[PDB]
Amino acid sequence: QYRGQFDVVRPVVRKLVSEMRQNPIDVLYRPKDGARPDAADVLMGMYRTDM
Amino acid sequence: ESILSRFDADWTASDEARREAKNDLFFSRVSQWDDWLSQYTTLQYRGQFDVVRPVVRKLVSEMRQNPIDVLYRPKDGARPDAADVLMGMYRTDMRHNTAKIAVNIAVREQIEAGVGAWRLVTDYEDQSPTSNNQVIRREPIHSACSHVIWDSNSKLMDKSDARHCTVIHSMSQNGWEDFAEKYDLDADDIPSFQNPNDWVFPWLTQDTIQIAEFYEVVEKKETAFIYQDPVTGEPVSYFKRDIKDVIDDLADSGFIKIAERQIKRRRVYKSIITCTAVLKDKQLIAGEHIPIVPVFGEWGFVEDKEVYEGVVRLTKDGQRLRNMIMSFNADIVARTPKKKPFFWPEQIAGFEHMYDGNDDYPYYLLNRTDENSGDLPTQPLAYYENPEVPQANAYMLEAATSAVKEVATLGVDTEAVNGGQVAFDTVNQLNMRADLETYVFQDNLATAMRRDGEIYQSIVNDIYDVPRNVTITLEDGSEKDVQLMAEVVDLATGEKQVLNDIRGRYECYTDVGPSFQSMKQQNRAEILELLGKTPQGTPEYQLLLLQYFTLLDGKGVEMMRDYANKQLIQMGVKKPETPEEQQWL
Numbered sequence: 001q002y003r004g005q006f007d008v009v010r011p012v013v014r015k016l017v018s019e020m021r022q023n024p025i026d027v028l029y030r031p032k033d034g035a036r037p038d039a040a041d042v043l044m045g046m047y048r049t050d051m
Numbered sequence: 052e053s054i055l056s057r058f059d060a061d062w063t064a065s066d067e068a069r070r071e072a073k074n075d076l077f078f079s080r081v082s083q084w085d086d087w088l089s090q091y092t093t094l095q096y097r098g099q100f101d102v103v104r105p106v107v108r109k110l111v112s113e114m115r116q117n118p119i120d121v122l123y124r125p126k127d128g129a130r131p132d133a134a135d136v137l138m139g140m141y142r143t144d145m146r147h148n149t150a151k152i153a154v155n156i157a158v159r160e161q162i163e164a165g166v167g168a169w170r171l172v173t174d175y176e177d178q179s180p181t182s183n184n185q186v187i188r189r190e191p192i193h194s195a196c197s198h199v200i201w202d203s204n205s206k207l208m209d210k211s212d213a214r215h216c217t218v219i220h221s222m223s224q225n226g227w228e229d230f231a232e233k234y235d236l237d238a239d240d241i242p243s244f245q246n247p248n249d250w251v252f253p254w255l256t257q258d259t260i261q262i263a264e265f266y267e268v269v270e271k272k273e274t275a276f277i278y279q280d281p282v283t284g285e286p287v288s289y290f291k292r293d294i295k296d297v298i299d300d301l302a303d304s305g306f307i308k309i310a311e312r313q314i315k316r317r318r319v320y321k322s323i324i325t326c327t328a329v330l331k332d333k334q335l336i337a338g339e340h341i342p343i344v345p346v347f348g349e350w351g352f353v354e355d356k357e358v359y360e361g362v363v364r365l366t367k368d369g370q371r372l373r374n375m376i377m378s379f380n381a382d383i384v385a386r387t388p389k390k391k392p393f394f395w396p397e398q399i400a401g402f403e404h405m406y407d408g409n410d411d412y413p414y415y416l417l418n419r420t421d422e423n424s425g426d427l428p429t430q431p432l433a434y435y436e437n438p439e440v441p442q443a444n445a446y447m448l449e450a451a452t453s454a455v456k457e458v459a460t461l462g463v464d465t466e467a468v469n470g471g472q473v474a475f476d477t478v479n480q481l482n483m484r485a486d487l488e489t490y491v492f493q494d495n496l497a498t499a500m501r502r503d504g505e506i507y508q509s510i511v512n513d514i515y516d517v518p519r520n521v522t523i524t525l526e527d528g529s530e531k532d533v534q535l536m537a538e539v540v541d542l543a544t545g546e547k548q549v550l551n552d553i554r555g556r557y558e559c560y561t562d563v564g565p566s567f568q569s570m571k572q573q574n575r576a577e578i579l580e581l582l583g584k585t586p587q588g589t590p591e592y593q594l595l596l597l598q599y600f601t602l603l604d605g606k607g608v609e610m611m612r613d614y615a616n617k618q619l620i621q622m623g624v625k626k627p628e629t630p631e632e633q634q635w636l
Contacts, residue, residue, distance in 0.1 A: 007365040011457045018462055021472045024564060051560055 053321035060202040060355075061324070064244065068200055071358065076196050078361050079164045082107065097377065102370060103363045106455055111158055113462075113471055120484055121562035121569035132630035137500055139183050140490065146186040157191035161479055165359055166195035168345045170218060173232070174337035174493075182498040197221065197245065199346055202355040208348060208481065212272065213341045217265040217323075221245060226262060240330065265323045265331065266339075277312065280305060288314070338493025338549070347481060363458070369451035372444070387436065394431050467579070468565075487559045494549045503546035512541050534631060570602040597624045 029047075037044060077088065085098035122141070125134045136142075145151065160167030168191060176185065201216055220226035227238050241260050248254050275292035278301040292298075302308075322329050349359050392406065396416050405416055462471025499505070524531075524538055546556075562569065567576070577584065587595065601608050611627065617634060618625055 005364060005368045007368065008454060008457075010362075010365070011460070014458075015460065018473060021474075026564065049560065 054324065054326045056321060056324045057201075058324045064246070065249075067356070071200065071356070072197055075164060075166075079159070079196065081364070081367070082163055094378070097374060100370070102367055106366075106458065107162060107363060110162055110475060111155075114476060114479060115152075117476070117480075117566065118568075119480070119566060123569070124559070124562055126557055126559070131628040135628075135630070140185070141487070143184050143186075144486075147188045150190055151188060153191055154189050157189070159191070159195045162362075162475065164195050165349065165357075166198045166346050168192045168195060168198070169343065170345060171342050174339070180497070192220075193223065197247065200357065205348055205352070205355070205357055210341055213267070213270065213339070215341070215343060215345060217263060219263045221262070222247070266334065268319070268321060273314075278302070278308065279312070338495055340492030342489050342492070344482060344485075350478075365454050365458075366451060369448065369454075376444075383438075391434065394434070484561055492551065494551075496548065502544075504542045504544045509542055509545070532633070574599055593622055593624070 077086075080086070082103055083101040085100055087093065087098075125131050127134075157167055157169065169189070170192070171187060171190075175182075199216055199219070203214075220229065223229075239260060240262050242263055244261060244263070248257060273291060275290070276295060277290060277292055278298070279288070279290075280301050322332060346357075349357060351359060396405075398418070401416075405414055462473055464470055503509075504511075567573075600610055604612070615625060615627060616632065
């Protein structure tokens with residue numbers, strides 16, 4: 001008994017997950033040419049609230 | 052069968068929590084002081100240690116301020132000025148400062164331990180009852196240790212409509228009068244649970260009376276979008292529907308309903324898993340919902356239960372060896388014979404005192420003789436002490452300290468971004484700017500600044516029947532456009548109470564990601580990236596005026612309040628939200 005407490009494996013784990021933390025990638029929808037949302041109107045307004 | 056219910060999982064105290072509650076205690080009581088749990092044959096005169104406090108204290112100070120919030124973003128395509136003064140709560144948000152930071156006492160909720168305890172009071176409150184200007188935020192309580200154990204869900208982040216457990220205030224004689232808004236029951240309630248002491252009765256300070264409190268049983272809302280044709284004709288309708296696929300609508304195939312079918316079970320006699328007694332039931336707190344935000348869900352799972360794990364235990368795995376060496380080197384101060392003067396005198400008991408501490412020179416103390424033995428240069432040189440070079444732990448104790456170095460590698464700090472962003476940021480940020488979705492969980496009465504056409508004004512539409520021509524405004528002489536004006540005025544509007552999710556009254560949403568502050572800080576954000584943002588030019592001089600002014604209309608600097616009055620069409624810089632003033636030459 002008493003081998004349980006030694007721990008210390010963490011430096012590998014806690015480092016990695018730390019430096020990959022922020023991946024915000026804020027970009028919006030480079031428009032498609034397939035349809036023509038010219039008359040869409042309030043439709044695209046809903047996608048302002050896609051936030 | 053109302054004796055048990057949830058109690059199927061609640062009888063376990065001496066079974067389940069024996070290890071769990073004791074380890075939750077054990078983590079926060081390892082964070083300071085001493086341990087005395089797993090030891091055998093232990094000796095005293097220790098226990099003040101408090102070794103780990105600072106290295107944990109870095110975290111709360113790093114994350115103590117990262118507000119991440121935005122204000123004043125009105126939403127509409129119509130005339131905006133209706134938003135200026137019409138709700139004073141959020142312009143008045145902070146009269147709360149002293150206890151704004153009181154989440155210090157709530158630091159028990161996350162790192163030092165789990166289990167945040169935050170519970171608000173009765174919604175609609177005492178002083179001058181009416182709705183606006185109520186300052187309550189972030190008020191923690193005593194201790195998180197023996198707090199809460201239940202088996203339900205432990206997944207959903209938000210508590211949805213109304214769920215946390217049942218409020219409990221335990222080991223608190225301050226709670227007796229906490230509800231003193233009660234009507235007075237003699238201060239005896241006493242369910243029987245939760246025994247901190249147990250087997251051995253010779254105890255100092257405790258009492259038998261206990262308190263735990265409950266409100267409603269699991270109110271779930273159903274809608275189901277059902278039309279009911281008389282086909283099978285079974286009673287007890289027993290219909291629960293969600294997805295619309297086949298059924299659709301029966302309207303012109305028969306009767307037309309256009310009504311509301313509510314099934315609300317009326318007064319089921321199950322009371323708080325109680326057998327022989329009834330006390331609490333049928334209460335209204337304003338309208339009732341949950342601003343309450345204690346005991347959030349967590350990370351890591353095994354069984355149906357709420358459990359986590361900690362961090363700094365990697366350090367004081369070596370302190371047991373400190374308390375170890377305190378045994379070995381304390382044995383020299385006592386056990387060791389301590390520097391023998393008397394070795395060479397071998398004669399046991401001599402005369403009265405040869406060394407009493409006298410200052411006189413002669414001590415005598417020489418005789419030796421032996422008969423038929425034989426000998427050689429016998430020397431005292433042996434004595435006892437030969438401890439060996441106790442540097443053995445050197446790089447091992449530097450390994451225990453460097454184990455604190457390894458956690459000191461967290462989120463290396465240099466400048467600006469690329470800092471210590473960590474999971475604990477997400478762990479305390481889960482509350483996540485919940486004010487403007489919290490404030491209205493119900494609507495009843497006593498707000499009505501303008502709504503529903505005031506419930507009277509709505510007929511101002513049709514008032515006068517005068518037969519002849521309808522004429523718009525004209526030039527009548529001196530006084531004209533000063534406000535409080537009535538000529539053609541009308542109203543189409545309407546409103547009522549509650550309707551918890553409603554838009555067209557639409558207000559607010561969450562804004563913009565990172566540490567970015569909204570004072571209009573987009574103007575001066577600047578040093579984040581240095582040069583190139585503020586050029587000039589011959590025409591741009593005019594354009595240089597409009598985008599920049601100091602923030603939140605502090606009267607220390609006025610400008611565009613009285614500086615927007617007129618101008619001229621040469622520039623064309625005018626329009627703010629433009630509530631009223633339009634003035635001809």
